[model samples]
Target: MEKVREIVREGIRVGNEDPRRIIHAFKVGLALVLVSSFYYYQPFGPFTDYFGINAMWAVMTVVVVFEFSVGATLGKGLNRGVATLVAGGLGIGAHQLARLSGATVEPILLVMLVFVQAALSTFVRFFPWVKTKFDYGILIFILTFALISLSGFRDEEIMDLAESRLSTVVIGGVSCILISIFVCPVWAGQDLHSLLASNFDTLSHFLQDFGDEYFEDYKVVEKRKKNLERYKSVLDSKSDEEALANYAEWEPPHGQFRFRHPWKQYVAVGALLRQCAYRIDALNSYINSDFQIPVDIKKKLETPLRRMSSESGNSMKEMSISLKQMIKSSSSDIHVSNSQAACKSLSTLLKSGILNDVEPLQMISLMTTVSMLIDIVNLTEKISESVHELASAARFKNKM
Candidate 1:
């Protein structure tokens, strides 16, 4: 009975954490039903005949372009629509040229198609700049063009074939846009903001816990392994966080935020916070050595170590608070001062005879860890500043 309850609780927790997943699934399902109904029911009677049987193209477009976030859906749908229009125009022009030749040059048409596709593939693959932005667009365009032009090779009315393809693609693209924007739409910007806030809070708790847990005697190895893995998971998400920040820039203003919310600065904040985590991880590694400090040295270092860790945690928590409130009233200087005092205490112990009884290796390791803590303090300060800048920029824009 206990195990069953625990399993159900875990399921509910997971579901609550990502409510957007459920919403997105429903949105896509609804889009499919609505698009299929429009084509299948023919509500407008003869008006639907213009689109022919290609109404499924609209359903396909919705499936392809609808994404978990508004920006992604907008980006993909627009790209598909533009690609189809350009390809239709080019395909029709080529078919007209082929028809004017008077010779039943199916051979020449095939040769031209192969050459054009190869050239486009080579160009897109070789050019770095164009490949970055337009590679997918160009590939889709070529595919649509080929489908229309190849079919036109045998058909007498090539223009109507191109028109049908273009119309069906437009219907699909527009359907995707309408469904994505109007449905319980999720925005990448909101996700990015929430993710950054959560990261700050996670880092804060990790900082405080790492210090306290290091002093424990039993099962240190297993605990350290779990802690290291947790921090590594956070480190590994840098690329994902950066991509989300970029996509969030394309999203329209929604929720409590206004237009042009300086989302790029959130990327900078994340970068700085990750740097702080790196130093913390390095500090943890240095402290994981088998050589334990003498009882006297541990006593002398305990205050400063606790102070450093606690102050750093407070700084991160304050940053998280500022992010939530959309204000920067908390001065980061208090964190700086606490860090300086902790370093001074460590410096006093180093200058004294506290380490005379300890080995050189252990002393060196302790010193290195202390140095990393100072570096972590600096990184934390930078993160706070970046958050401040982001808030200031947003406030300024709102005022205007």
Candidate 2:
């Protein structure tokens, strides 16, 4: 269990790069789509033969390889190759089982078996006694064998093709899995935690930059705001067409929402950024909207506090301080008492100052960007206090 947890952690922590991940998903989806076409009817002879065997192998190999390579390259080092091999075995097994059981019973049996395999593969870390080249591989084989039963294929002809082409899929898939693992190695192994931490850092760094350079400079601010909008649209978009439409709308510059109620505009923008990220994180934990952050600042926050090899952290800290100064200078009258008071009325998240590593599902929105969270609270508090103070001081004559 421990070893399995570690592997899982690595998978999440050393999460793959966005571009690679996107590519992997596209490829896998394409492979599945292509293979799925086989279910309804056979293609031409050699094509039919190939898909059942060669095509299966190609898709299986590429998909499995992509998964392994994505995980491995992203930083889940040691287990990726072994993991891929194990997964391939199960996938092939699923293909075969579909052949035997007439596709009906096979998928169910394969699922049950692979579930067991995925569960058991954890023995690698917990029981040093079970440690070996691929202790997980044992489960791998069992799962693979089980998956053979579940492939969801029904045609006896296809089964015959699978039987004939089994070796190709198995060999090809296994080989690509190995090659991909070799090509990319996952090093971080802190998938979830690292990303959460980095995400918070990202938000903080951007807010700091915005305060220092972009504030009230309509063009720069508009660019940054649209960038955030673009990020949001990407998150919301359901299909390529929808995504393009959203992107087009987002591309045009946005002047600050003509504040019908100035406070409402602040609330709206904050809500937007948080929801954008929240949605992206929900859709895919690995899907990072990292590109939205200005490239220069992103490079700054990528490194952890402990490993400040460059001046990035220093720059980040300096930027934060500068922004804090700006915020303080801009709103001197807002009483700390009011800000502190608003902090107490909260429900979701109140712990202010750059929210770096939110627990995706756990983190809630009190406000959006870090500075704005502070700003809004302070503004509300200030208005309340000012109204109270004015009321207390004035001797008003009741009108007749």
Candidate 3:
């Protein structure tokens, strides 16, 4: 009973995390129903065998091509459609040429043709760009070409078979594309944009919370473990941005994204954030480190350090909000300036005689953390500038 309840609870929670999961499932079912119609009519068959033998190709295509995001679905749809078309033509061409060698020699011709194509394609798959983007297409090409070519030798009606399979796949691909686009469409560009914004949010979260966590004189600690952990994703975003960027390029411009939208700027902004995430990570670690700060130093330095870290965090959060809204927020500039002024004050206060009474040996860890925090302040300025560039180049509207 407990096990059943646990399973039911988790299942609903999974869908709750992102209801799009349920929607995508329904879309898949819808696509399957569309393709299955070709088979269902078989029980009442004028074109049953025409579609029956290859009707499931539509089923295969729908299952294989219904990707989570619309861009991914479209990407796979084009790849499958083109691979099938090109392979079908080549198979027909090979068949005609083989016929010229006479029926007995035809087997020899077909065998050599298959060998050449198979070897060439397998080797080409080793190429970098092909493997990255078109690997699936090439795989489909090889399968479709070989299936038609090899199967044609035994089958009298090669055209009929090829035609049947191609049409079914088209029906399946089209259904997947339409359903994914029309019903609760998930755009990769939107996800990418949101990712960048949230990446900024995570960095801000660390900086904002770091002061209080590290120096408890006046800190706000909330979910310290998760908050400390989330900044790492910023460092890990490069590959995700690239993959999403590629798929996003395939998407027709929608919303604030125009044709030739500065997808490049988004990546550039992400790269800058990754540079800062490392420093943020280092700053975060000292919060719960083995070595502890002197209470005297913590008391004197607390207010200044808190101002520096919190202001930097505020600047980053403001930039993150701007990133989401697609508008330039003047308030972020004020926060960056506030952050800079706070850093200057922090440096002066550190120089103001408190450290003279303490051995520099005990101060090593505090010095490392303080220096990293100051660097974070400078680093966020770069983020602010790059985001501004993105706004201008992408012509993001000013805050109205």
Candidate 4:
């Protein structure tokens, strides 16, 4: 009972996060009903005979094509339409050629064609280029082509069978595209922008608070653990970034951005942020270990060390805010230059005999942490540069 309750609670929480999931469910149900009704009413003559059975194909096409976002649905719908058109044309041609051959030759040729088509399509599907978006379409084509071509050996009306399959696919694909775009459309490009912005905020919080988190009491540390869990999603977001980027590429011109928006650069910004987050984790671990800082040395180092951490954190906070603003407007007036000054302050203090007062162990840890902090500063600067470039490119393009 407890397990079931927990599952239900989680489902409710997820459902509330984005109401689009619920809306999408209803949209798909409506699409299926719309496509299925055409077959039931027998609006046209040629579609009457197999409408009952073939309508299932149209309904299934809607099920497969409608994705969570408009761009994703568009990608699948276009791929399905193209695949069916090509497959139907080729299958009809193959049927005609096989019909010309004698019956004995027809059976052998059909079997060989199926094997060859399946093998080639499967091979193409494995390629990196096709796997990104066209893999599903290619698979659909293989199935349709093989079935139509093979059925031609025994069935008299191969062309009619191909026509029914293609027509239903068209109905399904067109319905999904129109509904997904016109109805409360969730654009993958917008999702990608939101995701990238959210990640920036997460990384900023992690960096800003991680340094101070090291010296807190046990309860504070426990609370920090809960906060750290959020970073897991950002860290594991590479796959999500890739998928969203691909889908965003397929989206039409949205608000504020034109048809050929510079959304792809978002992937690079995500990669750079991940690198910076890793460095912060390393710096936090190096200082938070079993060893303790000597009272006198800790005193001498406290001001500059904490300042260095604070500077990076604050810069990241500003960067996150600037990124959010940039997403909203073409121009971002914010600049990040504090990281360089903070690194200089730390370097100056390091040379001022501050570590000479401590024992070797404390000195070593402090020195290493400072070095890591400098590296973190450099990484933060690079990230800021990347974000700046992306914003500038978009701004310039919009101006033109």
Candidate with the greatest lDDT versus the true structure: 3
TM value for model 3? 0.89
What is the model-wide C-alpha lDDT for candidate 2? 0.38
Cα lDDT of model 3 by residue, 1-400, tens digit: 7999999999988978888888888888887887787567755545535435666677888899989988899999999998999899999888888877786888889989988998899899999989778888999899898988887445356777777778777878998899888878999999998998889888777776676666552333556656666887777679999899878877877777888887877888878788888887777677666777777766767887888888888988888887788876677788888878888887777677677767776678767877888888788888888778778888777654
True-vs-predicted CA distance for residue 116, candidate 2, Å: 24
Candidate 3: clashing pairs of residues? none
Which sequence of candidate numbers ranks them by lDDT, best first?
3, 4, 1, 2
**Model 1 alpha-carbon miss at residue 354, Å:** 4.0
Candidate No. with top TM-score: 4
Question: Which ranking of candidates, highest TM-score first?
Answer: 4, 3, 1, 2
Model 4, span 1-400: residue lDDT tens: 7999999999999999989899988998888888888777877575534434687788888898888888898998989888988998988887778778877788788777888889999999899989987898898899888878876345566757877888888888998888888878889887887788788777667665666654547985786575656566677889999899999899888676577678669998888878876766676566446776655665666666576666667666666666655542322222235556656776776678655555788768767776777787777778776777887777643321
TM-score of each: 0.85, 0.27, 0.89, 0.90
Tens-place lDDT digits, model 2, residues 1-400: 9999999887766565344555544545654555546433555544435443465455554454344233332222223335545455556555565457664665576567667655666544457544423344454445444444444455444445434444444444444434443433221212322322333245434333433332116785676563355334434433432222221221112232111212222223233334434533332222222323333433322322112111222332332232222211212233334335434433223343334644433222212333333443343334334423322233222221
Q: Which segments of model 1 are wrong by more than 4 Å?
A: 1-17, 42-51, 125-132, 152-155, 217-226, 287-289, 396-400
Task: Judge candidate 3 at residue 28 and give its lDDT.
Answer: 88
Give me candidate 4's TM-score against the actual structure.
0.90
